[PDB]
Amino acid sequence: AAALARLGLRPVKQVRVQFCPFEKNVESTRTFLQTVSSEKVRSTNLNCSVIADVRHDGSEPCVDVLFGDGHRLIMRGAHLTALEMLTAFASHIRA
């Protein structure tokens, strides 16, 4: 959160997070959504866009990121945790 907003997350363009509210292993994705919907992270980048799909069909949360360079990152956020996903996101921003 704080580190992400500090590093500014400039190259990123699009950030999808999709999930089903009734699946169990989802609170990690919800925390990711929260920290990405925080004020400073979205204020740093207005051209960037975040999209939260609350689709109920299926039982598999997923995360997706598209960068200005065009790189495509995907996370199966079922057996993953919030801080881990954030560290991976920061590392790929560094990339």
């Binding site: 065009g70 790189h71 495509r72 990152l73 199966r76 057996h79 991976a88 790929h92």
Partner: peptide, 11 residues
């Protein structure tokens, strides 16, 4: 190529 996939699997 240009895409990457992160996945965690139980053991």
């Amino acid at each position: 190529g240009k895409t990457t996939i992160i996945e965690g699997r139980i053991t």
